[model samples]
Target: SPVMVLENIEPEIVYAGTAENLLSTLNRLAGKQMIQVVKWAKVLPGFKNLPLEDQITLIQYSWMCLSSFALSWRSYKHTNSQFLYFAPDLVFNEEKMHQSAMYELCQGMHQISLQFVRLQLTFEEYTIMKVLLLLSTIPKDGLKSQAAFEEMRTNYIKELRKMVTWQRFYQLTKLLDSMHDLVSDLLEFCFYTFRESHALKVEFPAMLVEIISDQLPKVESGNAKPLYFH
Candidate 1:
């Protein structure tokens, strides 16, 4: 499934500050007080003028906030899954099935992306899965075939326009801006897990080595040596 690139609008990020170096740096700074800012506050307004200790205090709280986000990232996924499972509102709507299928394919693509990072799966796997996901984005003639979407889309858009007030859209958009950061975190999670497993395979081979090494007694070593003995 080839991607049908739409408008050029780029996605936003969740946290602009959690650079790769920032993760470990934050962890190291998480001391008895549980967090530290160090020099991180240099980015904020007026932070540059604060006393060193005060700056550190502010950053430690910021660190706690970021760490909470890091943890909620996983928690939110689980909560979303479970909440969706019990939500009965959509059960009667048959047309959403298409969207659901699309969602699942999209999810599979995510899993594939993660799998590659973790296991170093070949490009073909990623490509094929990508195509599978692309299928979800293809437009269907829902209006003529399934009236639900046709009936709903226009009304939905209309309602959205009505509900949106410029005053809060900025705040909502500001919050929405974090999406990319969230996406990157999950992607990084996949990558790190992959490399981590790879590292373990290299650094701790002996832990796994015994199972394959000279452990399977010969098919019938009878009398040659006890089958179980080395």
Candidate 2:
């Protein structure tokens, strides 16, 4: 469920030293995080109106995006150095990343994530945006009730539009480009980590591994043009 939030799912659980300490801590807390997220959404007036299966699908496919959003929103405000900040208490050091490439990739993601933080999204805006992404996960096949899911998706999109005025939304989309850029890089990093763990013959958490696998972009797209942001 919680896979691409960050690719730190390496199975060195009992083995991580203080530097790599975030893993086990993250593992312990992820369950509670999802449960809290479920409760948070259930409070939305129309959430219960959706079919149970659609609700399950939305939550199931959403943890990665929501976790990513939470990490960005929760990122630290001041870092004495460029060390990446994922949470108030959860800062990461480059040396512990094992691969130089991985470290650089994380730096790229941290850059954009911080940019998002500076955009000053409200709690409601963040929640609405997460639900937007969650509902956007439309598949071409294999679902028994795509129509029901789409109906809910339309409603949420409309709600998000109402929450964000046109000019404000354009500004938000400008900031969202940073998110798009960071997500692209993070996916590549995840791919590399997934492969490197295999090369090392290391046993990573299969669930996280599979989730990252499912998260990668299926097709190539051209680079995004720059979006002006303060």
Candidate 3:
């Protein structure tokens, strides 16, 4: 039950339509989710304090991670769904999925929603988790004032603590960890999706492609850098 603890695209996207059709729908959906992530970060008090460059870099790095978290929530309540629910008409399917790789990646996300519903994850927990991931980043290239960035990260974590007990805090920590892991597991699929899409002559939305191009590597590199942070 504890592990089960938490919960939570588009249109006539042809499996083989010109990148034009699929790209608009899928990219727009993903990009829309990406923007939601950015908006959330922008509202954080700390977000305004970071250097402009850091703000851009952090958002770019965190968008895909946020995207998957958003995906899990969207997929959770969409019962009877057989694919990742991007939109009413734009859902992806086996035939249209990137390749041998796409299904496995999506399956990971599916399991996440099931896990969340089983746990009855609260919305508060989700909010805390998202902030935790965003704050997890230390001062990076764009971060002009490392000290200021750290302060922001510290304040967010402090705010997270205010919202939960030590135990739930750990629970939330673990949840964020899994979501980050979820993103990592999924990125491989993205690369392969691109590869297979090319093979099948299906085009990936350029914007959708840019989403991962932003942060998958640093995310996958060493530690669970997957903590949500924009």
Candidate 4:
């Protein structure tokens, strides 16, 4: 009989895994969304049915919207919070473009986040979907105008909820990830540039030009220098 060492020992690494790892991961992420993403982690009713290029187009536009603005709704848990207009006294709305721009920025961020995850640099977000859902659900009580805004945040969170296959979502992720990076940089600029006293008039315009040029590739940087006028 081989001398069996009468000792309790444990391996340095206990590697445990299974065939179900991939499926299990997908399922976990599915729960992160406000609602079930889809019937299965596989397809979409309208999106999957489209041609590949068509799908790319939808995502591209969405990414553009996200990277360019501050797109978050001011939510009120109570039914009476007021919306801020004109930033204290700067200038009342030539138009209320604030929220829309915010939405666009978020969309861009979402695209970038998803793409980064797919690259194996990080994990998938389903974040755009979540934020979209969140956007839908934001309550509009106390809005300047009496409005419910959009559908329930839950609806936005879960709208036509469905899972999209990896192969299908890849392009969306790529566009989104790049947009997210752009957004992160721009917002950083906003924080550093606009603060305390708004005395730095030139600073803002310069920042705007830089961001606009980056967002609109067709717009030349020089073309942007003048329009940021008071």
Candidate 5:
């Protein structure tokens, strides 16, 4: 569908054989995905109408949530929620999960995919949910165009409402609410991994470095807040 933006970008296959290499390889793919996330955001309907400052703020604040949500969708489709299907060639089995030294984080992500299975989520639903996620987080203070941002978010919510029954809406929203916590854990792991990238032998591209570095302090200081459904 027109809303499925991620189908447009494909990362190169990453080859790795060890713990450090696996982690680094994932980070590399992550960096690539991060760039595509920004590109996807730019072309989202009504996104460009917001102020430029708000555009950057929104993407920086919600990139991890957006990324993980899409990752879960990929896993759900490709692996039947069995593993992290980061890319066609970079799926993570349990052993790879262990070797990546991100076992807990990996399990949390896999659980989201499993939830996707339980719900039998549709592509349209997933697309709106992804947009909601991009609109979910912001600096605690406010956005440059807060009213515009809220309007866009509300429109997407209505779009979602038109597609599902109330019961399904509640279930899907409850799932979205749960993601804040999961993404929080993921962000903590990401920050730690970025800070100790040298010691951990993980690699972060300059693009990932910029977004993560910009977001880390805001998150640490509680300057950024995720909006929840429940």
Candidate 6:
């Protein structure tokens, strides 16, 4: 049986009164989601067994991928890839994308959701993929428990393989490979948003502020290493 990794709940409707309004709403939602992401990591099988530092490092490195992947899933589930269902209340159409000033980032995210529709992705597959994404990135020098990390990652890969047909597995792996590209774009937008929050009038909660501040330097200095299947 699969673990219930995510709960389905609707957020209050957020009206985009201005570009700042929309961006701020989305930023707040992202901050809220970040809390759940950390909770999920704590309860994940084998995750708690990792060295304390490794656990923190893994979550820090992979939060964006995890968040973006969940966004794609939400978009796929609610709108069938037609729009970004950020929250039940905060969906993004083309005009909203433009108004937010993150048009390209939104489009890249929508494209990932479209691929989910194209693949008819399953919940089980998505769960394993999320774990893989969490394990995909690290520091260039590697974790203190690098051996343990690889072992856990290998186990999840095998688990994923068991859930799909060979052809389906091939397609899913390709989709996973493609996520890194969009995630880089998302990181760029995130850093920019964090930097210009006052000027852009986008509000980032403390949780997002800490993660972004910690990650921005590592990413910019080329200390973060993103692993790819290809």
* The 10-residue segment with the lowest total lDDT in model 2: 6-15
- What is the per-residue lDDT of model 1 for residues 1-230, given as tens digits with 9 covering 90 to 100? 11112112111122212123332322232231121123222433233444554443333213322333322322223342212211122121223323333334224333333433344333232222221111111112211222432233334333323435354333322322332234334333423432464543322123112211222132112211110100
**Using Cα atoms with residue i matched to residue i, what is each candidate's TM-score against the true structure?**
0.21, 0.61, 0.69, 0.23, 0.91, 0.91
**lDDT tens digits, residue span 46-133, model 5:** 8877888898988888888877888899888877898888887788899988888889888988888999999999887887888889
Global lDDT scores for all candidate models: 0.28, 0.51, 0.58, 0.28, 0.83, 0.83
The model with the greater lDDT, 2 or 3, is 3
Model 3 weakest 10-residue run by lDDT:
2-11
Quote the RMSD, in angstroms, for model 5. Answer: 2.8
Model 2, which residues run further than 4 Å from truth? 1-62, 76-84, 93-101, 174-181, 201-203, 209-230
Off by over 4 Å in 6: 1-17
Residue-level error in angstroms, candidate 2, position 112: 3.4
Two-way lDDT contest, 3 vs 5, winner = 5
- The whole-model C-alpha lDDT of candidate 2 against the native structure comes to 0.51
Q: Lowest lDDT 10-mer window, candidate 4?
A: 1-10
lDDT of 4 by residue, 1-230 (tens): 00111011101111112213322322222222202222211143323444454333333222323223112111111111122111122211213324223334334333343333344231122333423322211111322221232233233223323334354445543443444456445444444333421443313334233333343332222221110001
Instruction: Put down candidate 3 lDDT per residue, 1-230, tens digits, no spaces.
Output: 21122221111222222443554455456655555556556656656667777777676666666667656666665654356666555555655555333556667777776767766766666665665566554333435677787776676677667767576667666777677677666666555555566565545456566655555555455422433422
Of 3 and 6, the candidate ranking higher by lDDT: 6
- Which is superior by lDDT, 1 or 5? 5
Model 2 TM-score relative to the real fold = 0.61
Backbone clashes counted, model 4: 23
The best-first sequence of candidates by TM-score reads 5, 6, 3, 2, 4, 1
Per-residue lDDT of 49-78 in model 2, one digit per residue for the tens?
Answer: 666765665555555556555555554334
